[PDB]
Amino acid sequence: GHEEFDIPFPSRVNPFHARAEDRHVAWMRAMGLITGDAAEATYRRWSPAKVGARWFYLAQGEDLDLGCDIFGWFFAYDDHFDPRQTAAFVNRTVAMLDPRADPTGEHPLNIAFHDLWQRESAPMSPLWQRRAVDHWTQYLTAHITEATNPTIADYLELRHRTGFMPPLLDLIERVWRAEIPAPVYTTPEVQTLLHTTNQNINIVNDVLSLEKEEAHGDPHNLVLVIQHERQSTRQQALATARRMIDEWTDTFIRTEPRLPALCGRLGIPLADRTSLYTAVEGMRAAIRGNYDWCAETNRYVHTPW
Amino acid sequence: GHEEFDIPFPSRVNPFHARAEDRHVAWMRAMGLITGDAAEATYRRWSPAKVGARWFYLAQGEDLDLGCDIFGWFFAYDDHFDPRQTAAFVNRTVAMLDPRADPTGEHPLNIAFHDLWQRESAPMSPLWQRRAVDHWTQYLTAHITEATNPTIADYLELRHRTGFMPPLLDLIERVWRAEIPAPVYTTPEVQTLLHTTNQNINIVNDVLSLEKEEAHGDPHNLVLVIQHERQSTRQQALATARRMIDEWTDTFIRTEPRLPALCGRLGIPLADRTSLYTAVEGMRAAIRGNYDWCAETNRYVHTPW
Ligand SMILES: CC(C)=CCC/C(C)=C(/F)COP(=O)(O)OP(=O)(O)O
Ligand SMILES: CC(C)=CCC/C(C)=C(/F)COP(=O)(O)OP(=O)(O)O
Ligand SMILES: CC[N+](C)(C)CCCS(=O)(=O)[O-]
Ligand SMILES: CC[N+](C)(C)CCCS(=O)(=O)[O-]
Ligand SMILES: CCC(CO)(CO)CO
Ligand SMILES: CCC(CO)(CO)CO
Ligand SMILES: [Mg+2]
Ligand SMILES: [Mg+2]
Ligand SMILES: [Mg+2]
Ligand SMILES: [Mg+2]
Numbered sequence: 294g295h296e297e298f299d300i301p302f303p304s305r306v307n308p309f310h311a312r313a314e315d316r317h318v319a320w321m322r323a324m325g326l327i328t329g330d331a332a333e334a335t336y337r338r339w340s341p342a343k344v345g346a347r348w349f350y351l352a353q354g355e356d357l358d359l360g361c362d363i364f365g366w367f368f369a370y371d372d373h374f375d376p377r378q379t380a381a382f383v384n385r386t387v388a389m390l391d392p393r394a395d396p397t398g399e400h401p402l403n404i405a406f407h408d409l410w411q412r413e414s415a416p417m418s419p420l421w422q423r424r425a426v427d428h429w430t431q432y433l434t435a436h437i438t439e440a441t442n443p444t445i446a447d448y449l450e451l452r453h454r455t456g457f458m459p460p461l462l463d464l465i466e467r468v469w470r471a472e473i474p475a476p477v478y479t480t481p482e483v484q485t486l487l488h489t490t491n492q493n494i495n496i497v498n499d500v501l502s503l504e505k506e507e508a509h510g511d512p513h514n515l516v517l518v519i520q521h522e523r524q525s526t527r528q529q530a531l532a533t534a535r536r537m538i539d540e541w542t543d544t545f546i547r548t549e550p551r552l553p554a555l556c557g558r559l560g561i562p563l564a565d566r567t568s569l570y571t572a573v574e575g576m577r578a579a580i581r582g583n584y585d586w587c588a589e590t591n592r593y594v595h596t597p598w
Numbered sequence: 599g600h601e602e603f604d605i606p607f608p609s610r611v612n613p614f615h616a617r618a619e620d621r622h623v624a625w626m627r628a629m630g631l632i633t634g635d636a637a638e639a640t641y642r643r644w645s646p647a648k649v650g651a652r653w654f655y656l657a658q659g660e661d662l663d664l665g666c667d668i669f670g671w672f673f674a675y676d677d678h679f680d681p682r683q684t685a686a687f688v689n690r691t692v693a694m695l696d697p698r699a700d701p702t703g704e705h706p707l708n709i710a711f712h713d714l715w716q717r718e719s720a721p722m723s724p725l726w727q728r729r730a731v732d733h734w735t736q737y738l739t740a741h742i743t744e745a746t747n748p749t750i751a752d753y754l755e756l757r758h759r760t761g762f763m764p765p766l767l768d769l770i771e772r773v774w775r776a777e778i779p780a781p782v783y784t785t786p787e788v789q790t791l792l793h794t795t796n797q798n799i800n801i802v803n804d805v806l807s808l809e810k811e812e813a814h815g816d817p818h819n820l821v822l823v824i825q826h827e828r829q830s831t832r833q834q835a836l837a838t839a840r841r842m843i844d845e846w847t848d849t850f851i852r853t854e855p856r857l858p859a860l861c862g863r864l865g866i867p868l869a870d871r872t873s874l875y876t877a878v879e880g881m882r883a884a885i886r887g888n889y890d891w892c893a894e895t896n897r898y899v900h901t902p903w
Contacts, residue, residue: 297868298868299858299861299862299868299871301857301858301871301875302875302879303774303776303872303875303876303879304872304876305656308613308614308656308658309613350656351610351613351655351656353613469608471608542858543855543858546854546855546858547855549851549855550848550851550852550854550855552606553604553606553847553848553851556604557604563602563603563604566604566606567608567609570606570607570608571608571609574607574608
């Protein structure tokens with residue numbers, strides 16, 4: 294009952310997905326993002342912790358909880374925006390990235406983000422933290438740009454450079470406890486793996502959340518952007534999206550086999566290489582987990598806040 | 599403290615590994631393969647259910663138990679043999695593959711194998727069962743050949759065509775509940791993945807169990823075979839094994855990216871493709887799990903039976 298894609302990794306879900314949902318809902322209620330039983334029941338119908346459970350299929354305990362909480366927080370933060378007021382709010386979210394931030398008195402979404410960032414950043418290196426602050430800041434401030442406000446090219450550039458995927462890619466390293474070695478992070482090979490994971494997930498979500506977004510008047514969807522730019526039919530635009538998804542998947546799987554030799558040329562110790570391979574497995578899991586979750590979730594029936 | 603290899607997959611262990619050991623030991627005791635507390639304590643020191651726990655890192659319940667029990671049975675069966683008496687015994691093991699077999703009165707090793715096979719075969723297709731019977735029969739009867747009795751080439755051929763890996767490859771499909779689609783099983787691509795998994799695991803085990811096998815006077819090890827054939831040093835032979843291991847690993851990861859396009863050319867439905875991708879993930883987990891387990895297990899200190 295949905296568009297189907299050939300994503301060449303197995304479907305997997307964390308064995309502790311059920312308990313993870315209870316803990317995640319409890320966090321959402323404690324942070325004031327879900328209020329009352331009716332909202333909670335509506336929210337649970339989305340399987341909202343299952344997206345984290347699929348991305349992070351072997352995480353346990355606080356690592357799993359962080360992975361699940363990021364996505365639930367995203368749903369709440371994203372739906373909050375549905376320019377002066379936006380800038381004031383978003384600048385408070387960005388302020389929670391400061392190591393000395395005090396969340397007292399902030400809006401609940403920003404108190405929650407402060408909690409997420411503290412848990413996400415604490416075990417990671419200064420190198421990871423620098424780029425993670427940049428990636429979070431871009432995702433957050435992009436809401437201001439949205440309020441002030443594309444071609445197909447503009448949309449694709451905006452999604453990959455200022456969307457939610459750059460933070461989610463950094464999160465993979467945290468939840469898997471597998472930071473990518475700095476000397477390989479900037480290589481064309483790893484940047485390609487990151488970029489193709491970024492766009493694959495963006496556009497698989499666009500295809501699978503299309504009916505929801507149309508129903509809500511939400512224009513930020515590649516399929517709608519293609520149609521508007523090219524005056525193409527719905528099927529034409531969906532087929533264009535499909536070809537793009539398939540090309541990114543193909544680029545990912547053709548690129549991964551280069552990594553061991555690359556690590557050898559860079560003199561990376563073997564234990565550090567296993568960190569890289571673990572992050573890349575996390576990318577595989579994210580690509581497949583995004584597809585399986587977007588395909589199954591009631592969020593995309595086409596409100597708990 | 600051991601030879602190290604670049605195996606480009608993450609290290610993973612089933613979250614239920616601890617309970618899995620208790621259940622596996624109880625099975626070994628119920629089948630008469632472990633007798634007494636001393637033997638049990640010695641056996642546990644090997645982390646004997648941990649090899650199944652690494653191969654099958656998401657399996658649960660009876661699927662996980664089967665995966666762990668296979669390896670424990672292998673240790674006991676393989677250590678039973680360390681030609682007329684061998685043939686009489688092995689022929690009883692092969693007879694347990696027949697659906698009409700009665701295990702009553704058989705040797706405990708054969709009663710146990712009968713139990714394993716009933717559990718392994720029950721959910722599998724007749725096509726899988728025919729080739730699984732063949733692979734088991736070749737592994738079992740090869741003990742007769744060993745009793746009657748190589749060049750490097752002969753050894754390598756014997757290990758991959760009649761050793762324990764062909765049954766373990768079939769077991770991957772069972773434990774993951776992911777049968778390889780019949781039309782793709784015989785393709786050069788899938789046969790290459792099976793062959794490289796086969797040889798990689800064989801020779802990684804030879805390198806990492808070498809000292810144990812030398813201490814026991816066991817000559818069935820590629821490193822010893824190379825030295826004997828070439829009159830080469832220990833380091834020379836280990837370096838040869840290393841080059842072979844690396845080449846099989848490289849062949850595996852260069853071949854996997856061909857599978858989606860192959861499935862397209864063969865007209866394989868997408869759900870069947872995900873079965874293939876799952877079995878291939880099982881091969882990745884086996885390659886890495888074998889390396890990690892052989893590196894950590896006290897079985898390789900250099901007896902519970
Ligand atoms: C599936 C998921 C939670 C995240 C991965 C995709 C992604 C990068 C988003 F920003 C969510 O897409 P969108 O902003 O379109 O949100 P929607 O309303 O489709 O859930
Ligand atoms: C590690 C494991 C159980 C299996 C993978 C290797 C393999 C295919 C074997 F047949 C082990 O044979 P061998 O008789 O050399 O096993 P050992 O005596 O070294 O434990
Ligand atoms: C043995 C398995 N244990 C440790 C109990 C799993 C706990 C998983 S958790 O922390 O996500 O609930
Ligand atoms: C919720 C997690 N459960 C299903 C209880 C794990 C049981 C794993 S098992 O069957 O291997 O013990
Ligand atoms: C809806 C299916 C399709 C358009 O007909 C788009 O994915 C197939 O190419
Ligand atoms: C013992 C290491 C080595 C021989 O010196 C074999 O793996 C390195 O090539
Ligand atoms: Mg949205
Ligand atoms: Mg969407
Ligand atoms: Mg042996
Ligand atoms: Mg050995």
